[PDB]
Amino acid sequence: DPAAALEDHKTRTDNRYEPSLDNLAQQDVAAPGAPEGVSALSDAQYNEANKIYFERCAGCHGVLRKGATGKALTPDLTRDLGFDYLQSFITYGSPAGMPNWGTSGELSAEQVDLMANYLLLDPAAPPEFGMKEMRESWKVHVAPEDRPTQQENDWDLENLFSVTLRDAGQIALIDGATYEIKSVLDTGYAVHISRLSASGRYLFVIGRDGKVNMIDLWMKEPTTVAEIKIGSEARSIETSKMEGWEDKYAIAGAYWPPQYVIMDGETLEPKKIQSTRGMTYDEQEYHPEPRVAAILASHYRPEFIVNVKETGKILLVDYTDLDNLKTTEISAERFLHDGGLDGSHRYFITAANARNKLVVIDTKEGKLVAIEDTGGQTPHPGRGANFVHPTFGPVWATSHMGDDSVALIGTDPEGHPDNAWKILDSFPALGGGSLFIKTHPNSQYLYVDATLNPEAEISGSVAVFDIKAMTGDGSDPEFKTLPIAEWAGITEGQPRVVQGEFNKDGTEVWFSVWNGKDQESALVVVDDKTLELKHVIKDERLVTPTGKFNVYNTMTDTY
Amino acid sequence: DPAAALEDHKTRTDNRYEPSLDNLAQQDVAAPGAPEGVSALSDAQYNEANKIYFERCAGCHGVLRKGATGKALTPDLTRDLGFDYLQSFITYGSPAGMPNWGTSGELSAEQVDLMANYLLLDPAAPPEFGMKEMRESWKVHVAPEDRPTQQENDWDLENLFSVTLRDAGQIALIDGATYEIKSVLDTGYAVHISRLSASGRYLFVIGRDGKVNMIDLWMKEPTTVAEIKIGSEARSIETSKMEGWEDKYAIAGAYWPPQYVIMDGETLEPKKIQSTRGMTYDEQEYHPEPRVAAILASHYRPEFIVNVKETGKILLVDYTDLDNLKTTEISAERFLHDGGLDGSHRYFITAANARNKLVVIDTKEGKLVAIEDTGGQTPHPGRGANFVHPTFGPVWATSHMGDDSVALIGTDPEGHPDNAWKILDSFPALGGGSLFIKTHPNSQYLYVDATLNPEAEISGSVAVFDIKAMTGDGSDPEFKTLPIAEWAGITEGQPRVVQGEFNKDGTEVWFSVWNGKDQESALVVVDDKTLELKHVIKDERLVTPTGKFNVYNTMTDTY
Numbered sequence A, B: 001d002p003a004a005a006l007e008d009h010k011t012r013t014d015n016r017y018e019p020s021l022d023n024l025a026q027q028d029v030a031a032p033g034a035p036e037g038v039s040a041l042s043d044a045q046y047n048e049a050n051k052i053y054f055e056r057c058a059g060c061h062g063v064l065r066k067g068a069t070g071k072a073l074t075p076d077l078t079r080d081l082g083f084d085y086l087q088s089f090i091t092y093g094s095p096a097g098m099p100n101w102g103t104s105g106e107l108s109a110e111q112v113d114l115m116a117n118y119l120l121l122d123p124a125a126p127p128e129f130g131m132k133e134m135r136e137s138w139k140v141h142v143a144p145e146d147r148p149t150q151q152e153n154d155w156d157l158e159n160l161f162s163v164t165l166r167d168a169g170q171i172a173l174i175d176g177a178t179y180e181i182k183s184v185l186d187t188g189y190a191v192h193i194s195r196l197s198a199s200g201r202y203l204f205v206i207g208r209d210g211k212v213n214m215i216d217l218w219m220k221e222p223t224t225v226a227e228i229k230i231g232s233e234a235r236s237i238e239t240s241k242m243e244g245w246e247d248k249y250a251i252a253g254a255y256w257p258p259q260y261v262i263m264d265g266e267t268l269e270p271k272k273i274q275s276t277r278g279m280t281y282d283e284q285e286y287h288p289e290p291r292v293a294a295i296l297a298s299h300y301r302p303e304f305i306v307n308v309k310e311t312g313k314i315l316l317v318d319y320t321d322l323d324n325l326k327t328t329e330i331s332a333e334r335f336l337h338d339g340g341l342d343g344s345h346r347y348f349i350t351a352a353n354a355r356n357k358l359v360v361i362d363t364k365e366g367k368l369v370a371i372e373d374t375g376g377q378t379p380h381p382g383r384g385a386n387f388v389h390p391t392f393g394p395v396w397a398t399s400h401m402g403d404d405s406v407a408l409i410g411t412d413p414e415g416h417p418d419n420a421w422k423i424l425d426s427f428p429a430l431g432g433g434s435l436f437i438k439t440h441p442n443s444q445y446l447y448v449d450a451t452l453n454p455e456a457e458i459s460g461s462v463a464v465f466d467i468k469a470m471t472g473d474g475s476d477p478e479f480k481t482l483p484i485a486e487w488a489g490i491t492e493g494q495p496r497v498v499q500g501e502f503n504k505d506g507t508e509v510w511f512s513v514w515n516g517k518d519q520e521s522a523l524v525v526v527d528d529k530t531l532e533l534k535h536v537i538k539d540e541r542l543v544t545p546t547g548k549f550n551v552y553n554t555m556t557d558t559y
C-alpha cells in the first residue's frame, strides 16, 4: 500500500538529522540507458532527478541506493514495485531536513515523476576521490618554516571561540572574555566542526564539501596556512592527542567516498587513505556505503577512534606506523554517530542512535566493554556531559532527539563497580528534539537544549539541572528553563537555540540562537554562577551561527 | 593502434596463470540499457559476451573492469576508444589460459563483435555472498561429538598424500609408502589445494567455486564431516598454526566477492567475513576488486597471513579475538600471489609476480623487511624451496613462469647478515613456464618443473640441481633432466609434469603427469637418493591429477 508513506515518510523530531548530500548533488551526471520495459530520462531530466535524490533522499537511502536508515531502493526492487507505486508513494512527501537550510520534503508533480523514473534506472557510483585528487587540491599557503616560532598576536588563544557561520561558509574567531569578533574567516562551503591541535596552535575546520582548512593561531592575523579536499561529502575531523604526538597528525572522515584520511598535522599532506566499505558487524553482509561519523583521538594510545555508521564498527587506528598499519576493528552496533570520552579519557561512549544504544569502548585495552539501551528514543549526545553525580559517582549523560529524556551511564568500573556501564537514571528535560547536553568541571549545572522541538517556546529555551541537588531516589530532578532566544531579542522567523559551549574557566556558557541566512541570529552568553544573561553577541556578519568551540575545552577534551 | 595486441594480447609463458572465473561465468546476468551513442545487446548476446568475458578476460581486466594486470576497461574509457578500435584489437584474440582446461583465446568474428559491444556497456557487479548465504550452504554432516576421539583406521596419516583429481571434482588419499589409493572422495569441482590442520587430523579442501570440504582423517572411513560455500570464485584456504591454536580455525580466501572468511576449525561455522575492497598501497586509489591470493599461517603469533593482490597489501589477521579484530595491513607490492615461510618459519617471502619482485615480511615484528627484484620474469614459487646453500647459508628459492631462471634469496639476518634479503644467485633450469620448485631437509636436490613450456619434451621433464655441488661462484650450476612424462609411459597427447611434493621422510618426491580429462594421466614417484624412477601410479580413478599434498609436510610447513 502506497499510503504507508504517511507514516514512513512523516517528519519527526528524530528523523531530520540524516545527511543531505548537497555538495555531491552539484556534480552533473549523464543519463544511463534504460533496459527493456523501462522508459529513459533525458540527460537534463536525469540530472534534475539526481540532484533532488542526493539532496533529499540519499541521506536515508544511500547515494548507491543500498539503504541506510531507510531500505534499499535499487532497480531490482523498484522495478518490481513499478512506476505507479513509486509515483504514489513519493507524492505524499519525504521527511524534512534540518531547520533553516534543510529541505521541506515536498515535490511538484513534474518532480515526483522524475524521481519515480530515476529510481527505475541504474545509478552509476559517484566518482571516487583518491590520493591523486587530494594532492591536486592540496595547497600549502604558508610553509611551516615560514610561520611564526611564537604567538605573534596578543590574543588569549585558550579562551577563544571558533564559531561556525554555517550558510556563509565562514567561521568567527570570538574573544571569550570581551566577546569581540576578532576575525571572520572564509573557507568557501559550510563548516561542520572546528577542532584544535593538542598544542592549541592549529585550528582545523572541515567543510561539508570535504574541504579542510588549517589555520595558524600564532600569526598576527590568523588565516589558513594549508588546505586540502578529502572527499565530496564530509562531516568529521580530529587531531592527534596522545602525549608525545602533539601536532603530528590530523584525520578527516567522509560520507562519500566512504573513507577516512590521515594527514600531516603541520602541512595537511595526505598520508594514508582507508576505505570504510566492508561488512556489517551483525548480519555480516557487504555494505557499499559505510559513512564515517564521529572521529575522536585516544589519550591512552597513539590512535584515532573512528565511527563507521552503517556497518557498526569502531576503528582504533594506530598512527605510529602508516605503512605497517595496525588497526582494531571493533564490532559494536549499527548506526554509530556521535560520542565522547568519559571524564578519565579512557572510555569512548557513543550513540548507535537509530537503535537507541550507547556503546562503550575501552581505549586502553582496545575492546568493547558494554552496549546499553538508554530507554529513550534516538540518543544524540554530541560529545556528551561528564560529571560526578553526588550519589552515583562518575557518570556521562546524553539527551535524545526522539523524546525529552536525559540518561546517565556510570563510567567508573574500578571505583563504582555495580554502577559501571549501567543506565543509572533517566529523567525529562524541556521536550523532544534535543541535540546537545553540556557541563564543565567548574560548573554545578547540566544544560540541555531542545533545538528540533516543534514548539518555539521550547526550541528557543534551555533546561538547566543542578547536579549538586541530584539524589538518586529515582525521582525526577527539577530544572530551570532559560529563555535563551527571548534573551537575544529575536522573535522573527523561528530561531532555534543550539549547543552549549563553555569558556576556558567554565564560568560562562554560550548558546547559538540559530535563525535563517536572511534573518537575525545571535550568540547568548550565560553566567554559569547565576544562570542569568551576561551578554548578547549580534553582528550583521553573524549568519546562521551553529557550532561553537572553545580552544581550551576542545584541545583538552574537557566536557 | 590495434596491432599492439600482437605483444599484449598474445600468449606468453607467463601470462597463462591469471584467474579464469568459469564458475562465476555460469551465472546469468541482465542485459543493461545503452546510453546515447551506444547500441544495446540482447539478453542472449549480453550473456554470451559476459560468459566469454568472465572465463577469458576478467582475470586480467577484472569483472568490474577496473583493471588488474591489464588496464581498466570501464565504459568511459572504451567509449573514447570506440567500437572500431575495440573490434580491430579484439580480432587478434586473447592470451590462452592453462593447458588441459583453459581457453585457447581464439574468437570468431561474431564473438569479436559481441566483446567490443559488451565493453561499451555498463557492467553490473556480480552478487555478493555474505553470512546469510554461507550459513544456508553450511552443513555439518558429523557433529564433533559424534566423531572419534582417537584414530579409528589403521592408515599412516602423516605419510598420506591428498591428490586433486581436478576435472572429476574429487580428491584421492594415497598411501605414501605403498602407493595404494586408500579412498577417493567427492568434493568441489576442481579442488585447488589441500591443507591440513596443525594436528594433522583434519583435511581441508577448497574448490575453485568456493566450496570448502572438511574431512576427518580419524574416521574408520574418512569422509566430509562439514562443508560450506564461501564465495563464487576462490583459490585459497589455510589452518591455524600458532602453538596453542591447533585445530581452532580455518580461513578461506576468495576472488569474488573480494573477501576472506574465518571459520570454526571443527565445524566450519563462518565466524568472521572481511572485505578486501580498499586502496592500492602505492597510488592510494580505490580498487573495487582486490582478490585474495595465497593465505599462510604464522608460527610466531596467532595470525593468518593474507595476500591481497590488486592493492598490494599483506594482512596479518589476529584470530585471538574476532569481535575486537586486530589486523596489520602491510603496504607491500602490487600483484602479490604465492609465497612461503623461510626455514625458520619467521619470514614470509612472497611473489608480486607481475612486478618481478619478492616481498619479505617479518611475521614476528609484523613489518615489511624487504622488496627485491629477482632479475627474472614473473616469479612463481608456490611455497618455494628452503635449503642451506654451501656458500651462502640459508636461502629460499623460486623459479619463474616467464623465463628459465631460478633465483635465491638469503634468509638469515642473524647468521648471514650480508646475504639477508638479497638475490644471491640466478641460474637457468629447463626453460620458461616453470610453476613449482621443491626440496626437503633430508634431500640434497632441488627440483624445478617447466609445466607451461611450449615444448613437449621440456614440459614433460624436471630439472634437478645438486645443492651440495653449488658454489655460488657465478657460474651456472649443472642440472640432471628427469624424463618424468616418459617414465609414466603415456602414448596420447602431451602431458604436462607439475609440482614436486615429498613424502614425510623426504626420501621420495612425487610429480603429477597431467593429461586431459578423457586422456591418460599418472603420478610418478622418484627415489630422491638416486634420482631414479621408484613407482608409476596409474588408476582409472586418477583423472587429471594436479596438486598433491603430503599430510606431514603440509601441516608443518616443511618446504
Ligand code: DHE
Pocket (backbone or CB within 6 Å): A016, A017, A018, A019, A020, A021, A098, A099, A164, A166, A191, A192, A193, A208, A235, A236, A237, A238, A292, A293, A294, A295, A296, A337, A338, A382, A383, A498, A499, A546, A547, A548
Ligand atoms: C558526523 C557528524 C558529527 C560528528 C563530528 C565529529 O566527531 O567531528 C556532527 C557533529 C556536529 C556538531 C558537534 C558538536 C560538538 O560539541 O562536538 C555540531 C555543533 C553539529 C551541528 C549541526 N549538524 Fe552535525 N550533521 C551531520 C553529521 C555530523 N554532525 C549530518 O549528516 C547532518 C545531520 C546533515 C548534514 O548534511 O550535514 C548534520 C547537521 C547539522 C546541523 O544542521 C547542525 C545543527 C548545524 C550545522 O552547522 O550544520 N554537528
Ligand code: DHE
Pocket (backbone or CB within 6 Å): B016, B017, B018, B019, B020, B021, B098, B164, B166, B190, B191, B192, B193, B208, B235, B236, B237, B238, B292, B293, B294, B295, B296, B337, B338, B382, B383, B498, B499, B546, B547, B548
Ligand atoms: C591463489 C592461488 C594459489 C595459492 C593457494 C593457497 O595459498 O592456499 C594457488 C596455488 C596452487 C597450488 C599450490 C601448490 C603448493 O605446493 O602450495 C597448486 C598445486 C595449484 C595448481 C594449479 N593452479 Fe593455482 N591457480 C590460481 C590461483 C592460485 N593457485 C589461478 O587464479 C589460476 C591461475 C587459475 C584459476 O582460475 O584457477 C590457477 C591455476 C592452477 C592450475 O591450472 C593448477 C596448475 C591445477 C589445478 O588443479 O587447477 N595452484
Ligand code: HEC
Pocket (backbone or CB within 6 Å): A008, A009, A015, A016, A018, A053, A056, A057, A058, A059, A060, A061, A069, A070, A071, A072, A073, A081, A086, A089, A090, A094, A095, A115
Ligand atoms: C529518512 C528519514 C528518509 C528520507 C529523507 C526519505 N525516506 Fe524513503 N523511506 C524511509 C523509511 C524509514 C522508509 C520505510 C521502509 C524502511 O526502510 O523502514 C522509506 C520508504 C521509501 C520507499 C518505499 C519502498 C518500498 O519497498 O516500499 C520509497 C519508494 C522511498 N522511501 C523513496 C524515497 C524518496 C524518493 C525520498 C526522497 C524524496 C525519500 N524516500 C526520502 C526513510 C526516508
Ligand code: HEC
Pocket (backbone or CB within 6 Å): B008, B009, B015, B016, B018, B052, B053, B056, B057, B058, B059, B060, B061, B069, B070, B071, B072, B073, B081, B086, B089, B090, B093, B094, B095, B115
Ligand atoms: C592477461 C593476460 C589478458 C587477458 C586474458 C586479456 N587481456 Fe586485454 N589486455 C591485457 C594487456 C596487458 C593489455 C595492454 C594494456 C596494459 O594493461 O598494459 C590489454 C589491453 C586490452 C584492450 C585495449 C585497451 C586500450 O586502452 O587500448 C582491450 C580492448 C582488451 N585488452 C580487451 C580484452 C578482452 C575483450 C579480453 C578477453 C577476450 C582480454 N582483453 C583478455 C591483458 C589481458
